[PDB]
Each structure stands twice: as C-alpha cells, then as structure tokens.
Design a protein around this ligand. Structure first.
Ligand SMILES: CC(=O)N[C@@H]1[C@@H](O)[C@H](O)[C@@H](CO)O[C@H]1O
Ligand SMILES: CC(=O)N[C@@H]1[C@@H](O)[C@H](O)[C@@H](CO)O[C@H]1O
Ligand SMILES: CC(=O)N[C@@H]1[C@@H](O)[C@H](O)[C@@H](CO)O[C@H]1O
Ligand SMILES: *[C@@H]1O[C@H](CO)[C@@H](O)[C@H](O)[C@H]1NC(C)=O
Ligand SMILES: *[C@@H]1O[C@H](CO)[C@@H](O)[C@H](O)[C@H]1NC(C)=O
Ligand SMILES: *[C@@H]1O[C@H](CO)[C@@H](O)[C@H](O)[C@H]1NC(C)=O
Lengths: 133, 312, 133, 312, 133, 312
C-alpha cells in the first residue's frame, strides 16, 4: 500500500530529525565540556606558575637573609674584637660611656690618636692627668 | 667615637633572626625600572608595524616589504591587521612559534606543474595595486573551461636541510560557487610524505561577512626532511604553494610589545623595554630575552654592605 | 517497482540503525575519555598540592633549624665567654673539673659568691688555704 | 655551677648541624589541638541545619525560615536533605561557590507577564502545608485550557549592580504528560542578554523513582550586568523566575563541618572548630577561614629559647 | 506518485550522507582535540616534574652550602683562637711572618716543640739569643 | 707550622658567602656511577626475557613457563614480542600498573557452563606445539552447528578477597566471517556486577595484516569484590575467561631495563643497575626502587670535612 510506504517515509523522517537534533545537542554538550576542561587546565597552569614564583621568591628572600645575617655577624664580631683591643690598650686614661665609645678625660695632640690607631700606646704619660680630670 | 655616626637616613634590611633592622649602608639588589625604549644593538630587531608573522609569511599586500627579512627578535605590535582574503590556521600558536624560532623568511620558489586548471586566482578583497590580487606565496587554481582534473604532483628533497611547505583549502559559501569554481560537488586535498599524511575536505557553509566575503581559507603546513618526497593529490579546493621556506635552527624568538626602538645597548629585552643587567634580580616581567636577571615577586630587596646604624 | 522501494526502505533503515549504534558507541567512548581526563587532572592537582605542602613544610623546618642554630651558637658562645671571665678572676683558689665547673678547695661565706657574681674578687685572701687544701 | 642544672625533663630540638639535641628550655611552634566548638564572634555564622545553600536559595519548604539570610560564613551539615520536586544543577560547584561568595540571599520580586498560560504550578512531592506546593522562587507555567503560546518576555537592567536570575527546564517522564502539560510535542527555552545566550531543550525519558516522581528539573542561572536587557523565549517546559537576587562582593565563603556553635572569640575557623592564632604554624586542616596560621605536615616543631642541657 | 516517493528517497539519502559525513568529520575533530589536550597535560606534567627537580636540587645546594659555611667558620675560628694562644705563649722568641706562621730566630731541640704543643713554655731561656738573632 | 701544609691536590667547595673556595680535605656527597648489574638479593627479581607482563598474563605460548610466577620486581626487556592472536587493550597502562602492583600471577580456574556453543577455539597464528592454538587463559566460543544462543551466565563471590576477570571481544574482518563464526549479524557483550556494567559491540572492518590476520581482539577486565556477583550476557564475539586471578596488596612494581642479573646485595634498583646507598644524593635516575637516595640535577656536590687550604 502506498499509504503504508508514506507512513514509513514519515516515521523514518521523524527518526532522521530525532537523530539530527540529538547529535547536534550532544556535540554542543561536547564542545562545552571541551571549553570547560581547557579552562581548568588554564587555571591549573596559572596555579603552577604562581606556586613556582612564590617558592623561588621565598628562596631568594631566605638566601639574602642568610647572607645579611652572616655579614652582620662577622662585622659586629670583629668590631667588638677591636673595641676590646682598644679597651685593653686604653686602660686608665679614658672611659667608655656605654655605647662602645671612650670619653677621654685629658687632652692629647693627634700623635696620641695616631698611636691609638696603630696599637702602640702608653697610657702612663697621661694617666696622672686622667685621674686628675 | 664608636665607628658609626648614626646617619640621618636609615637603611632597613631584612634578616632571618629579626625581621627588619637598621644598618648604616645598604645596596639595592633588584632593578625595577625601565627606560621605555627597545635597543637595536647588538641584537637584530625587526619591527612588525602593522603585520603579524603569519601575514608577513603569506605575503599580505601591505607587508610585501618584509620579503626575506632576517630577524634576531621579532617585535609584534597590537595595531596589526589583515587586508587580504579571510583565512584561518589550525594550530596557530604552534606555527607561530615554529616560524618565530626559525629566524628567516627566505622563500625559494619551485616549479610546480598544474595541467588542466587555471592558475593565479585573484580576489577583490586582496587588492594588490589598482586591480584584484591574492597572497604572494600561494596559487589559487580553478577549473579550466569546463573541467577540473585530479591534480597529482610530486617533489623530491635531495638537499641536506628541511623544507617547509605552506598550503591551504578553500571553504566556499554556497553550493553554486563550489561547482562554478570546481566542477566537482566536493573537494579533497591529500598531502603525503614517506612517513606522514594529511587529508582535508572543504566544509561548505555560511560564515560571518568579513570584508565582503563569506568564504574562508584554512592554512596548513608540511615539513619535508632530507631524503624524502612530497606528493599532492586533489580534485578541488586547493590553495597550492609556490615554493618552500628554508628552515634553520638558532637563537630567535618573538615578543609582543608596544615600545619604540632606539640605538642604545642592553643585553635583556622585555615587553617594557631594555633593562640593565648589573643586579641579580628584576621585578618587571617574567617574559625575557637575552642574558637577563631572574624574575622575583618581591619589589625591594636590600643587601647590607656595612654595619648596624645603632649601638647595642 | 514497489519491491525496489521496499528494498530501499530496508537498506536505509539498516544504515539508520548503523549510524545510531555508531553514534551511541562513539558517545560512550567520548564520555569515558572525559572521565579519565577528569581523573588525570584530579590526580595532577593532588600531586601539585602535595608538592607545595612538602616544600613549605621543609622551608619551615629549615627556618626553625637556622633559628635554633643561631640561638644555640650565641648562648653557648656567651657562656664560654663568661666562663673564661670567671676562670680569669678564679686563678689560684679553685680549679675546673672538666665540665665548666670549678671545684673550690676552701670555704667562704656567701659574700665570696656575691663577689664572684659581681666580678670584684681577690683570690689572695684564700690562696694560702687553697694551696693548703 | 656552670649555668644550667641539667633539668630532669629533657627538651629535644631539631638542628641542621646535628639532628636532635637536648637543650634546657624549649617552646612549641605548632598549635595542634582544637576546642571542638565554632565561635560565633566576631564573625556572622549561619547554621544550615538540614538545608544546603541551593535549597535555601530555591525556597525549599522546610528552610523557608532562611529568607534574606545574611551570613559571613555558612556552615553546611551532612544531615541535610531535600523534600521538594527532584531537580538537577549543571555546574553545581560553580553556582555553589558563586552564591557562597556573594554573602546574601536578598531576593527582589519582579513583575513578569505570562499571557496565555496558567501560573503557580504545584506538586504533591513539595507539600507546603497541608496542600500541594512548589519552590517559592520559581513559577511553573502550564497550558491554559487547550493551548500554550510562545512566551516572549523582556526585562531591562537600568540600575548599577548585577542581577542573578535562576530559571529551569522540566524533563517529563512520558510522551503523554508532555502534551498534557505543554500542548507542543517538544519544548525549548532561550535566554539571551546583549552578549550571551543559552538554549535548552527538554529530554523526555524515564528516570529512577525519587519521592514518587520520575520527571526531573534542570536548574540554570544568568547574570545581567548594568545597562543590559534579558529576553526569554519559550514554547514549553519552562520553570520561570519570580525576580532576582542582589549580587555583592566581599569576604564570604562556605565550609562543611559538623561542629556545634558557641559564643567564644577566635579568628580562624576550620571544619574541626576554632583554633587560636598565637603560634605561626598549625597541623589541623589545610582548609581555613580568617587570619589563620599556615598548614604544615609536621606535628611537633620545637623552637629553642635557651641553652644546651649538658656541658661539652 | 511513485516519482514523488523516489524523490523523497533521494532527498532522505542525501540527508543520510550529509549526517554521515558530518558525524565523521566531527568525530575526527573530537579525536584531534582529545590528542592535543592529552599532549597539553603531558607537557604540564613535564613542567611540574622539572620544577620539583629544580627546587629540590636548589634546596640540597643551599643545605650543603650552609653546612660548609658553618664548618669553615667553626674551624677557622678555633684555628685563630689557638694561633692567638701560641702568639701569647710565643711572646719574644719568634715572630709571625704574616701567614699565621712563626719564624723562629733561635734553635731548640724537639723538647721545645713539645713544650709549645703542650702549652707549657718559657720564652725567657732563649729570649736572649732570640734578641741576638 | 700553621696547621695545614697546603696539600698539592686542591679541594674546591661551594659556599654561600663566596662561590668556590679551596679547603684541605673534602668528601663527595653524590653517588654517580653504577656497577652495571642487577642484584637478585634480597629482592625477588623476575626476568621477563621475551615477554611483557600482559603476554605472560594472557598465556602466550612462548612464556607458558611464567605460570604462577611470584615477583618482587619485574624487569621488562626491550626485545619482547608477541606470537599469538593479535590483540588490543583499552587502558593498557592502567592494567599494566594494576597487575605490576599486585605481585602475583596466581590463576584459579573456574567452571563456566557454555551451553549451545563450541568451546576451545584455536588459531594458526598462535601455534601451541605442532598444531593450532590460542591463549591459555581464555576460551573462544563459536556457533554449534547452525546456531548461537544468547549466553547468560552468573558467578557469585562468597570469599573475602577480590577477583580479577579478564575477557575480550572479537572484531572480525569481513561480514562473511561474522555470520560464519557467529550466526548473528551483530555481536554484543554485557558484563555486570552489583555496582557497575560494561557493554561492548564488535566493530567489523579491515585492519593492517599482522602475522597473517586482519581481525582483532580487544581485552577488558573486571574486578569483583567480596559479596558481589558477576553476570555475563552475550550473543556473539565473546572471548570468555577460564577463571580468576587472586588479587593482593603489597610492595611490588615494574621497571624497564636491559641490565643483566647477578648475585650481589644492594637496596636500590634503577634501570641502570643497583646503586649503593651510603650517600644522601644520586645523579643516575629519577625512577627508583627500594630505599634509594634522592635524585638531584647536580653532578658534583662536595662537602667539606676540614679546614681551608690556604692561610688568610
Ligand atoms: C606589554 C606588557 O605586557 N606590559 C605589561 C602590562 O601588560 C601589565 O599590565 C603591566 C603591569 O601588570 O606591566 C607591563
Ligand atoms: C570535618 C572534617 O573534614 N574533619 C576531618 C576529617 O575529615 C579527617 O578524616 C580527620 C583526619 O583525617 O580530620 C578531621
Ligand atoms: C634504561 C634507561 O632508561 N637508561 C638511561 C637512558 O635511557 C638515558 O638515555 C641515559 C642518559 O640520558 O641514562 C640511562
Ligand atoms: C655605601 O655603598 C655604596 C655602594 O654603591 C657606596 O657607593 C658608598 O660609598 C657607601 N657608603 C659609605 C659611607 O661607604
Ligand atoms: C621556658 O620558656 C617558657 C616560655 O613559655 C617560660 O614560660 C619559662 O619560664 C622558661 N623557663 C625558664 C626556666 O626560664
Ligand atoms: C679526608 O677525609 C676522608 C674521608 O673519607 C678520610 O678518609 C681522610 O683520612 C681525610 N684526610 C685527612 C688528611 O684527614
């Protein structure tokens, strides 16, 4: 019957439209999922880069901190060493005020300062006036 | 007195025992400013004023002055645009980094034999002068009178370097212009070497109007190694090549920047300009070219070169 | 011929079933691949987090170690300094046993301990009994 | 004697020269215990007893007390459930974090005009009182007598803040209830702004029986920025909105925890409770809210605040 | 009409071929995208591994550097200490040349070297010949 | 003299204040050489001479000596090949790491009842002896006379461990050999537990010629937990299992290496051989087994164990 053939045509056309729209919406879903996965990978890359940057920056900060600590330690240690040396050679002429500085009680020409700076000093020539002042 | 006179300007320094203390003298360890200009010495800078690398590769009519340009660093501006047939590149970033890292635009023309078709197709959206035109490195073949035979051509590589071939496929707009340009109702392009193959079929459809056209072109590339051979088979919608670019290996790259170019000397180049490299660290950009200092996230890092600023 | 039309119906229905099942299995493969890629990204995130945690923990461990080293160094250095100071002021009255401690040979009231703790001491008043003991 | 009396309790400390040595005194640097309760000061805590954020957003009938709730930190319990029409949210985590970070449930009702349909659809799985009901922020439109015209409505945004619209689509169970609820044999919903668009089509099919129903609802959302306009077009299977939520930006988040709430004061909140923040490190949870200490993997880290415990 | 039915057959076959080729090319695109995403995840894994390796190696480098610094500091400090001790006990018999080494002006048997190494030395028995040499 | 006699051989050491200085004595902190052999003590090494793990699992006819092999570390050579029916495994790496980490090839045979089909199918590409053969752990069922009924079989798991079942599907080459092996014009295999299911349909088509065949086999696996049940339904193109492997948990892995095996003692194993573990660092491979030292990128790292080599 031609009517049966036409009904078959109608139903196969219906199935055709069905599979067409189904494939279309599935492809739309698939491309959406593709985009979201791409964005996920993008933000993951960003997080990795941020982590690496933070870690390397902190490494640099710690490195320079260690270097600063070493430098400060060596310089203030040798400063205390030389200050103790001076305090040894400066026994009973001047007196330290409390900040690592010696207040001198007597007057002496620049030759005395030179003798202090070269470590060859006799605090007896002026010990009398130092006790007197 | 004690050794330091308590300078009026304090110098705060970061430690690990304390956090921030005052010392007499200190130096900065991070160069954080730029001059604003891009040195052109001793590097070879090429200024892509209104063209990108791919448009200068294809032969856009307004950057035909960039034929056989040799660069050491390509500078890409943001005011660049295209004024030819609308096209499209699958894997655009890969090709851009491949051509950027090659360092040459040297193009050797080769003699292809296309029998049965009409060569040198043109377009009114790619005017070269007062008349119609097209890209300068490609050949647009169409039907010859009433037929379009199956093109099948070969080219061997007997030299000792790699060859880069750039070809394309034409996506028409309607089903009348397909058969009015290629008598076949469907096109197909096969490109094969001794170890790989790529086959593309045009996708007829409508596109957004761009410069007066709704057709498109897709751009592909092939790499032929020494001792190989290339075979091209097609029956429509083929944008043939005219030759090959010579492929090199060396030190070359690409950088997006809108900074002018001067005649100074600097060894590092960032999209902000040239930066000196006397300091170990920098806080300008993490994208760098040359012998640059490493990118940190901190701005001021000070290194002590003296003693404390206060006793006790 | 109606038989030819019916054969065409049969073959188009066959092709219809073919494309239906093909699309179905392809979609199944696609969703499986989606799930496995999601799991891959998940374990990658886990690995990144684990790496960050390990690195930050080791940074903290190294930081506290450096701090401990500095503290111990300063305290034991100043302890040796004061011990040498005492040994200087304690010349010929007592003797160190080997652990930084002085065994005293003579007896003295708490005034002597006070004089030791203030650095103003004369080891001559008891040097005789110290040599005698 | 020498300075330290060799305390009976040793204090093992980690160094870099040695591994673990004994010192006189030491302090702990890691807070590793919790009180068990969640302070409600000075933060504003909201206890989602038997409802999640999305159910309190949609208007579930047993958390209708959570209308216009303002939180600073939402606490989600595990005993939460839904007792309304079964639904589904594509991109659930995105919406959950978007509403969690907004910090308000303020809902402004708007006047939509649906002509040709019947409004205020109900369900016997979402009883509001002794009778049938539905979600309180959505409007279920069905056919009016014998027809269902194409709804097409518009709403402009003339204010200076963003508006969040929540809508949905109805997936029926059979092909008889589709045409008995929407005379069209297929539904479709298009929602468009001046810069984006979302179109959904219902998927007829059978589902697992849930609370007496085999139909479903899918929940979507739209964001309208100041100066825009929204247009909704449909011909069936539309769960319309009733208004918009006001969108804010600030400091707000969400946390899953089953800890009770007390009236103490603490600045950090973890799913285990409030933790003090006097120490630099913590070993409780890597998920934290407020000005908390950083999460390490080590349990006991001891910092020396004295001298060695033994001579030599 | 059988001609209308045949035209319907032709057009449904056309649509069939259309959806076939469309699904085919879409699947090809999808598998290409799958491969490129797989490669992206691969290179991301490589970058993560490289970052971890670099960071751990730098940590080891910094660790051994700190250890070397501590060792060198302690050993050269104690060396300077003992050298100052010798210089104290070696007052007016020999003289340091500038590299931490004492040039001796007089001759003494190995008993003198032993007395130096045990810290029990009298530089008066040979001070006369030391000033004479 | 001063304490050090300025040894003729200098020892350069890396510091943080300076870069590289000279000291008297130094020690190396990185073991950077290998012996070339793989110890077989105290670990249990299995040498997969010409077979991979999957071929020794399936029952390839030239590694039938590897039945019920117990390994602590499997060593895979590069000269391995397959000499049976060409096959294919979806998620090959996952299964390889799952079987590598199990540590046993113990196979318990089970009694399946296939009524209406012919069992023990063979192939001339998998000769077991002088005659035709197949894999030893699978059963190739074909039509019995003129029909192939729908096989539907069940197997419960009443023990207290997991069971691993390996099955497959047959992809024919033409449409004549499908109906000449399985009377149905299309096959289908469904495998279901109480919580999961996998359904596969054969894909008829032509393949590259491999060892004289253009058909293929796809290999799948299932895991049944204690208290579950397995149901298998099919109407063609099924490569049935013969039993289950016992699944364990412990310390086991796999490593690709082409190094011989000796009778020494070492605690770490790399693809280069055994390395001693007296030093904290190593620069051989980042893939390691046992209690090995960590992989660094530096070659020579020297640790000072003395004093400087020069005064001042
Ligand atoms: C050419 C270029 O990238 N310049 C950057 C700019 O993009 C960036 O916004 C700014 C601060 O973030 O630093 C500079
Ligand atoms: C609410 C919450 O997450 N509490 C966690 C729990 O999940 C975890 O198992 C435990 C130790 O792992 O610490 C606590
Ligand atoms: C079995 C194995 O992987 N051996 C590796 C080899 O692959 C690598 O090329 C070489 C240096 O890179 O070190 C060794
Ligand atoms: C401080 O250091 C800088 C380094 O650039 C140097 O130029 C300057 O002279 C120093 N100041 C003093 C007082 O030494
Ligand atoms: C040890 O340190 C703690 C720090 O909390 C302090 O309370 C205690 O007094 C210290 N012990 C001594 C003996 O100083
Ligand atoms: C240098 O150190 C090594 C460590 O292996 C040791 O064997 C050697 O005796 C040391 N040299 C000296 C002179 O102490």
């Amino acid at each position: 019957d031609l009517k049966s053939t036409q009904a078959a045509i109608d139903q196969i056309n219906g199935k055709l439209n069905r599979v067409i729209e189904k494939t279309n919406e599935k492809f739309h879903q698939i491309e959406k999922e593709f985009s979201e996965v791409e964005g996920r990978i993008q933000d993951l890359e960003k997080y990795v880069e941020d982590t690496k940057i933070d870690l390397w920056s902190y490494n640099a900060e710690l490195l320079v901190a260690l270097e600063n600590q070493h430098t400060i330690d060596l310089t203030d240690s040798e400063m205390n060493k030389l200050f103790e040396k001076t305090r040894r050679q400066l026994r009973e002429n001047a007196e330290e005020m409390g900040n690592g500085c010696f207040k001198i009680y007597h007057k002496c020409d620049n030759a005395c300062i030179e003798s202090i700076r070269n470590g060859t000093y006799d605090h007896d020539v002026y010990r009398d006036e130092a006790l007197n002042n | 007195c004690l050794g330091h006179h308590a300078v009026p300007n304090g110098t705060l320094v970061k430690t690990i025992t304390d956090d921030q203390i005052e010392v007499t003298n200190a130096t900065e360890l991070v160069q954080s400013s730029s001059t604003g200009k891009i040195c052109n010495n001793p590097h070879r800078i090429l200024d892509g004023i209104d063209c990108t690398l791919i448009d200068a590769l294809l032969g856009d009519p307004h950057c035909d002055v960039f034929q056989n340009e040799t660069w050491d660093l390509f500078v890409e501006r943001s005011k660049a645009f295209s004024n030819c047939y609308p096209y499209d590149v699958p894997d655009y970033a890969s090709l851009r980094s491949l051509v950027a890292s090659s360092g040459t635009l040297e193009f050797i023309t080769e003699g292809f034999t296309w029998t049965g078709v009409t060569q040198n197709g043109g377009s009114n959206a790619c005017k070269r002068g007062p008349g119609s035109g097209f890209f300068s490195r490609l050949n647009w073949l169409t039907k010859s009178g009433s037929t379009y035979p199956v093109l099948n051509v070969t080219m061997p590589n007997n030299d000792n370097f790699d060859k880069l071939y750039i070809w394309g496929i034409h996506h028409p707009s309607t089903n009348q212009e397909q058969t009015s340009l290629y008598v076949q109702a469907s096109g197909r392009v096969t490109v094969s070497t001794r170890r790989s193959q790529q086959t593309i079929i045009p996708n007829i459809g409508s596109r957004p109007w761009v410069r007066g056209l709704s057709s498109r072109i897709s751009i592909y590339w092939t790499i032929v190694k020494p001792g190989d051979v290339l075979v091209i088979n097609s029956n429509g919608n083929l944008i043939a090549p005219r030759g090959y670019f010579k492929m090199r290996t060396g030190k070359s790259s690409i950088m997006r920047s809108d900074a002018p170019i001067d005649t100074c000397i600097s060894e590092c180049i960032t999209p902000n300009g040239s930066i000196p490299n006397d300091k170990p660290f920098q806080n300008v950009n993490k994208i760098t070219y040359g012998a640059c200092p490493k990118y940190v996230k901190q701005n001021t890092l000070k290194l002590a070169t003296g003693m404390r600023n206060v006793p006790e």
